[PDB]
Symmetry: D3
């Protein structure tokens, strides 16, 4: 019955990520923006309804939920954990509102972001405004196909949508965002076989490496987590490449939706802290998480009732 | 006989404007890059040939030409003139190499720019990188359709391509680049009729205003320059919007190609210094020029012979 | 009977509205066509099936229903009410059968209409035939974006499809059709701010005006109807621009699908008769309704299995 | 060289034909419009530049040419000849101005026609306008593929544009406009083989019938005129299906461009009056001409220089 | 609840049919491929996600089911019946594994087939490989529109998906595959009306012939089977044209999905053996069946759990 | 003045290569087909001409020219020269007529080939028929991008169209066709760096290797022929991947157009016989030539005058 936000939509060719902090006394402005965001998205996106698939997902951080709403907090909504392994660390950056805008053209995303920021001209403060674009075969900046094993259909619904465990917030999701900056020089220093061993998949054919050859510290092996029931826990992640050529900045904005934050937290702990058979993820040797945050994206019905 | 660059192409949806300055001792690397920029463009763009429309235009500033080539300089190639008008001024900023990359997708432009700057590591210091996107209705940040009256066909090449006036540099062109930052807050405070009077075109229908009603200080009226023999002086403009909603940065990157810089300089003088019947252009009351430069784009044959 | 006649399909770029009336003795061939309309639509559309998205919706008027079928009538399905306000009027032109054809290309719609009328030749009288096309940003003849606030997903299904209130006719809908001829000269005589105040949304960015500034007599304000339980009533509408510049004729064909006709009747009454705080809709000052009719679009299986 | 109009354009999905008669005293309005038709077309069609492919062609009748322009007349521009055949006839209807608008979507053509008629309010009387649409395989309403043997490339330029025979009007063309109402019942009453014999080509594969079995009175055979020197005489046709289902009106709007009207006049005479081996064209047994006119489409610079 | 193998996917423009026979001792490799086929399809098809629509359907023959799996068998699974009609005979050919690959481009299908065969190298013998391409308007080699009356929506699910009748194998389907070679010259010898009477539909308009004129031995009149309870028995068919001009070979590869094989068996018996009012199907006079097999396509969950 | 036979057309997604041998006494039928091939191509293509891009190129072998035409012969026409290298051989196969059909869909190519072969039924013997498909990323079966360095525009016209050196046959070209079978099993055993060194270009980004480190026996370094006057000899080649997974056949059909066969013969001699610094091309260690022929594709007007 509850209507989830557009989190199950397929990834498009253009996206904008807005991580924004809320200034003191701007709670009412944020409330009315959350009420009107669906109408704003519809108005901006209907001008190109046949093609463009404009979709805005709004999430609220743990530190802002108790300041905006006086009801019951969603279960598991907590500030992003600080993971500091022996070598790499995951830093948590301030963030209260997440606006994830996706469309086939950057113009629609820019217009929607402009409208949203205009409605919040003097009540908030931007933190991590980022534009992201796709490549030829949906590749990332590391040259590998990204998001191949994303759950689809009913599997995605079971993986990312909150069910009867939190009846008051059915249809919501937990989104973990993390901006990484790559080291392209070191990555290009390695051979293609070394890159495949680091990732765990073939670079050209995208065929997953055989289990008897896949290294224990590869990114794919460490992110493959199986729960107590024997089924593999999965999340609907949508990485977006980004960067500026002049500043020699290349990176990836990872966003991951789940029905509970525990799956993403376990994946991050395995990647950073490492398992018994692997000190840490190999992909972290060439990628540093410059920012990280956690948000809760509620159902559209909850947002429309403010 | 000479082969001009891709300066005569339809305005694509995505573009990257790179302006860089050559450091000391980097002339040899710049020459090496210019000797194979066409090959790099072909290699990057052939991967998506039918849908993609990748095209890179390379231009050399007046300062860089003396230190790069020992031959005769192109006629009219001079450092960008700075106009100190009574109210507005056109600032001239350093720049020695311009790469104007255009494609239907931002990924191709980003890959080409990455390859170029990787070839130019250490040799040049980046000065201005702009990622321009084109709206669904190829409108400006002011909401007006841009490039409607661009010359096309034989008129375009007769207006932008150097002919027999400079036989040694036939097929080249002069490109004036200028970055404008718009004051959207003040622009939105004007009625649609006021905006149309400022621009000189109808906002929705894009129909030019009548001669008896068009204001003398409108942008279209001031940029319409008649030649000494009754002909109309024309330039090719590929200005595109750009900006980021995080910093309240909304702007337009203007690039203009001509046979000689005299036409563009006259248009700029009319816009900034004004006319006897108009103190200055009205569009400058809402746009501020923060970067201006002039470059010469030679024929592909000239670049391939280095 | 869960089988709607594709009335939830998104708006396409080309459409044909065909309202006809059946003369005496034509009740037999019309029945034969109604059992073949789906097959004809499939046969015409499958050629362009990858992107043709051809869809035909058939509706039966109040008189035509009890003229053709001898079963129980659907709840409602009254002849279209004629509203005669202090200034504007809503005429109720005769109409028995409505064919709403939608496709990305006009050729598919024209072929389907040609086949339908060839099967119907000699037994119907064409009351109205309108070819509608879509502008750039789904604009209407007034220059505003049309259909922005259309319900989508499960909300549209709950808003247009008949539920358990009429179990015998589940999956159907009630379609109200009207033809408006705009006064383009008067509309262009107004400033853009005046046009936005008349409509209720910004012309450029399609963002609707704030509550404290939106006029009480604007079209959007008057068509925003709140139900007795606080839930706003919604309908699915596909307004198609049409006209010919030779006759200086410009207009919009409005079609509205609802679960019950009462919602559309209330919206029309508020637009024409007006409320206490607004004499009538402002958009009616530049639009004149030349036709008007109400039809019931039954479920696909009901048309296939006549009774 | 003179710049030709948009006559040399490919067949397009949507078209509008607008034939009007200039009222008394409305010469000045038409004259000032003709200098603005190119600007109006550019303004309207630029909004959909990548795919709109909007193009407007303007033609002037003989009486309209006499009333408007006081210069020399083109070699053609005689009032459309009315052929009184033994069975069929080609009526000549009044017409002074022809606007042929072509675009991929009918909205562009409608907007351009609206602009033109608004500029022509109170000065012209619309004789008739036709909204033409293309079927699946560019077919006509008779079920056959239309325009298969149209000239292309330099051959079309030689057979359409006016050359050195009339140097003062180089780049123009002569357009013959006719409106045919088909008898679909009689056409459908014929077998497919009979229809192919009527037309002269196979309906299925669209291949031409072999010359030993093609009937002498077939449409293809009769409109295959051989020049005095043995060179084939050809014209460019852009037939547009049209009709209204409610009125049971089905028909084709034929427009034919030539470098001289005599080619189209000879084709029409062969079709209607017939040859020695054929009383008349067979396709005329199912098509009735209800509107005929002849116009001259001048070069773009001629219209601009007014 | 169980997820099918996307047997309800819309018809695409390119397909590959691969029928192979498992060699002795190759059961383990076949099981591994059946486990990894979903991952292989996801990896190959993700490179072109928006377009392409790559989908692979895997079916196991009756002779191979008892060799690969143990414990239970589908109720309807059995070796394909051979029909020895008075004139036409439907031959049964050895087939153990069926791979039906569909995509908008043949390259994706070829890559998927290459991966599958490489995984199966040394374990299976390729009995048949067919590359089918969609014709002009979904026509077949006979020129008639193919697939017009396929069930869609919930009707297709009720017609092709196994329900509560076989709970252990819910979500599966039964696929009957045949390869017909056409006598194109003899078919073209017939008139268009004769062809329509043989098929039962209009050649151009695809309108079904009236019941008063439709021949009793036409293809449509013979494949229209009414159920015992007055319902209509329906199957999902994807007929793919194929052939080579060098060998003068043209044909259609027919695949039919059903919830039970009884419907397809009844249709084949009516087509070949014929009813009381028709000796056999008329289309069989111009088509010869050179291949026939029956396979069971289980739910994706069953294939994954191996 | 002469019209080229659509040789300069851009590469499409689907192609059909037909090589046939004229039987004794079938010269008249071949002449009739050569006369009617343009009409057949137009008739087949105009159904999908908005985006079909169908184009048929016809070439006549050296032996067939002496039989079909009794006039003068093109200077460069001669039977294909078989090269017997130390380890590799270029076999010459009997081929009299070449039909190279290109279109965005295999449907148009198959229809055109069917019509052509039907007109040639009983007159020619089909020696070879290849259905070539083009990968999603313009790659070949070796995983590298093909045709990156193909000449375009004026350079291509100068390089592939014969001019004043043979005025009687101006507008024609010489096409060399070869059928290659690849050893994918051995090719995949090499590292990506080894594959790049064999080819001579980067596999990922298609960037040509630097002048140093580039092997002297690489394919690119061996097909880069410098003319006597310091210019680079270039040909327009359209390699098409092809094969079947059932027979484990993978290969590339190479077709190369030139203004004279000397350039292609020199390239083949360098690849097979080898230079002083390279025994032979490395790519030949994984590709075997099973077919080789040379044809002369004349101008369209030459074929239309039969
Ligand atoms: C710079 C950071 C990252 C990059 C470039 C990256 C890229 C990739 C790539 C190329 C793959 C293989 C392709 C595919 O499976 O679709 C993959 C797999 C995956 N990654 Fe990431 N990833 C990053 C960070 C993360 C993080 C932070 C998480 C979780 C917290 C994550 C979770 C996963 C999962 C669940 C899979 C699929 C595992 C499987 O298929 O068994 N990734 N990633
Ligand atoms: C006569 C000419 C009409 C025109 C040009 C027109 C056009 C429009 C436009 C531009 C809007 C605002 C944009 C949008 O909501 O998508 C709108 C809103 C709407 N109109 Fe109309 N309309 C017309 C007549 C009608 C009629 C006759 C009805 C009902 C009987 C109706 C019902 C509505 C509704 C329900 C809305 C939604 C407003 C909201 O959800 O806040 N309109 N219409
Ligand atoms: C009145 C209804 C007409 C219809 C339905 C029609 C349609 C056709 C068709 C289907 C063809 C064969 C396919 C093709 O050539 O593309 C054709 C050929 C042709 N028609 Fe028409 N046409 C009509 C009138 C005319 C008129 C009035 C003229 C000239 C005054 C004309 C001139 C030609 C020419 C020149 C050809 C090509 C001849 C050739 O290829 O040798 N047609 N027409
Ligand atoms: C037999 C299998 C062949 C394959 C797979 C193949 C593929 C390639 C590839 C990948 C390239 C580099 C990328 C590109 O130029 O687009 C290339 C270059 C080239 N190849 Fe081939 N080729 C083959 C045979 C031939 C033959 C037989 C010839 C001539 C008789 C030839 C002539 C050329 C030429 C002229 C170039 C351009 C190199 C340059 O301009 O620097 N190739 N080929």
């Amino acid at each position: 019955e509850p209507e989830p936000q557009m989190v199950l939509s397929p990834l498009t060719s253009a996206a904008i990520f807005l991580v924004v902090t809320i200034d003191s006394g701007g709670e009412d402005t944020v409330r009315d923006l959350l009420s009107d965001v669906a109408s704003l998205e519809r108005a901006v996106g209907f001008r190109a309804q046949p093609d463009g698939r404009l979709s805005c997902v709004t999430g609220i951080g743990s530190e802002a939920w108790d300041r905006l709403f006086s009801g019951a907090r969603p279960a598991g909504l907590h500030p992003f954990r600080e993971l500091d392994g022996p070598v790499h660390r995951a830093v948590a950056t301030p963030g209260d509102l997440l606006f994830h805008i996706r469309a086939s053209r950057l113009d629609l995303c820019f217009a929607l972001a402009t409208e949203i920021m205009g409605r919040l001209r003097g009540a908030v403060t931007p933190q991590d405004e980022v534009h992201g674009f796709k490549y030829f075969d949906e590749r990332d900046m590391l040259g590998f196909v990204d998001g191949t094993e994303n759950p689809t259909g009913a599997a995605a619904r079971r993986a990312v949508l909150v069910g009867a465990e939190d009846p008051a917030f059915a249809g919501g999701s937990y989104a973990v965002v993390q901006k990484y900056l790559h080291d392209i020089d070191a990555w290009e220093g390695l051979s293609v076989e070394a890159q495949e061993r680091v990732i765990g998949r073939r670079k050209m054919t995208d065929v997953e490496l055989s289990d008897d050859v896949k290294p224990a510290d590869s990114h794919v092996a460490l992110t493959s987590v199986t729960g107590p029931d024997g089924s593999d826990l999965e999340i609907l992640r949508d990485n977006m490449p980004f960067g500026s050529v002049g500043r020699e900045e290349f990176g990836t904005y990872f966003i991951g939706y789940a029905r509970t934050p525990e799956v993403t937290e376990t994946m991050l702990e395995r990647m950073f802290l490492g398992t018994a058979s692997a000190p840490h993820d190999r992909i972290l040797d060439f990628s540093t998480a410059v920012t990280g945050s956690l948000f809760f994206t509620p159902a559209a019905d909850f947002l429309e009732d403010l």
